[PDB]
């Protein structure tokens, strides 16, 4: 059943497979169906934008992916706390809330606190009957457009430092090398043992 040189093959068709198959003869029909549910939804509601709330800025989980920025889930309260808005007020204003999200940095915390007040800067509200509790005049002179698109404040913005040019100094060109890693790794798998060999000198008495 095999012949002259070729791949060895395990094709997974020993199981019954012709009674579960899924031809996508409706994937054009499902694309222009779920465009009607974006046409006749984003006009049906409001001058509120399409594509949902403001999402915060979020840095990725894998070592592979920690260098990059992603539209996360919700500002996890603290960003509602340093910026100072009420949590059940926030999700009717148009601000997403994700309570099980934590903050264990101060660098990333203020990165959304300015973002939230920046959203609150570019927000205009409609008071019901124009007595205006804590909203200004005529509707920002007008609503200027009907709907906004693909995210409020461009949630990617994968910005990068310029770091233009420098003069190599004395300390920078002599030290920071490969041997600073082989001894760095040697204080990762020869550190706990050297805690134990100093216990040998405290029991030598």
């Amino acid at each position: 059943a095999p012949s002259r040189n070729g791949m060895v093959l395990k094709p997974h068709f020993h199981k019954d497979w012709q009674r579960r198959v899924a031809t996508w003869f409706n994937q054009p029909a499902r694309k222009i169906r779920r465009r009607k549910a974006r046409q006749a939804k984003a006009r049906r509601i409001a001058p509120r934008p399409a594509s949902g709330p403001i999402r915060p800025i979020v840095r990725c989980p894998t070592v592979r992916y920690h260098t990059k920025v992603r539209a996360g889930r919700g500002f996890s309260l603290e960003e509602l706390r340093v910026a100072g808005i009420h949590k059940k007020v926030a999700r009717t204003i148009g601000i997403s809330v994700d309570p099980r999200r934590r903050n264990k940095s101060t660098e990333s915390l203020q990165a959304n606190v300015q973002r939230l007040k920046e959203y609150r800067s570019k927000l205009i509200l409609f008071p019901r009957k124009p007595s205006a509790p804590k909203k200004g005049d005529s509707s920002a002179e007008e609503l200027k457009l009907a709907t906004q698109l693909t995210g409020p404040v461009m949630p990617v913005r994968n910005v990068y430092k310029k770091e233009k040019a420098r003069v190599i100094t004395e300390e920078e060109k002599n030290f920071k090398a490969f041997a600073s890693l082989r001894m760095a790794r040697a204080n990762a798998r020869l550190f706990g043992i050297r805690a134990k060999r100093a216990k040998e000198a405290a029991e030598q008495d």
Binding site: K15, W17, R20, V21, A22, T23, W24, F25, Q27
Partner: protein
């Protein structure tokens, strides 16, 4: 603070003051019928922390289940199979006995939706269970809009689909790496999702 004392006293059922009336009403239930109507839940703390509210509408059956895993219903043990399939006597029936108790308690009453249930006794052969029920069409349950979630007709027969507290313990689902054996919906929905051939249109 009363129910916290009822809870913690009941949660020590090998001391001598507990295992007297733990077993004097194992006998007192074994002389009644197989399924039965108790007029009031014989451990009141547990039934209401599962959702009992002592008013018009709810009804609390205790029923009996014989213990033990299932014997394979094949005549004279002749399973007629390959030698990994001669399992007549050592088979264990992957749905729990507490949910068999909720089934035939909900099977007898066609017009009673079931909330959930709990454990009230064991002999060596019998394993008793109260089962607390909810009448859908009573007007004290069709009002009270925190209970109108059960008069909705998608909650017909929450056992034979397996949607109670005890039944869904045996469905295998949950979150985590321990339960991604069933990662889509239910156990035989992931088997459709993995083991189908998802050829595209521009394949």
């Amino acid at each position: 603070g009363a129910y916290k004392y009822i809870q913690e006293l009941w949660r020590k059922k090998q001391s001598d003051v507990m295992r007297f009336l733990l077993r004097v009403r194992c006998w007192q239930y074994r002389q009644l019928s197989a399924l039965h109507r108790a007029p009031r839940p014989t451990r009141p703390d547990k039934a209401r922390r599962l959702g009992y509210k002592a008013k018009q509408g709810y009804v609390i059956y205790r029923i009996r289940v014989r213990r033990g895993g299932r014997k394979r219903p094949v005549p004279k043990g002749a399973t007629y199979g390959k030698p990994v399939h001669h399992g007549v006597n050592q088979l264990k029936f992957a749905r729990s006995l507490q949910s068999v108790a909720e089934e035939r308690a909900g099977r007898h009453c066609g017009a009673l939706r079931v909330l959930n249930s709990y454990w009230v006794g064991e002999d060596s052969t019998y394993k008793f269970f109260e089962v607390i029920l909810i009448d859908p069409f009573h007007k004290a349950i069709r009002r009270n809009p925190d209970t109108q979630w059960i008069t909705k007709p998608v909650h017909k027969h929450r056992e034979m689909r397996g949607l109670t507290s005890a039944g869904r313990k045996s469905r295998g689902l949950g979150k985590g790496h321990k339960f991604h054996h069933t990662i889509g919906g239910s156990r035989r929905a992931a088997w459709r999702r993995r083991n189908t051939l998802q050829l595209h249109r521009y394949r």
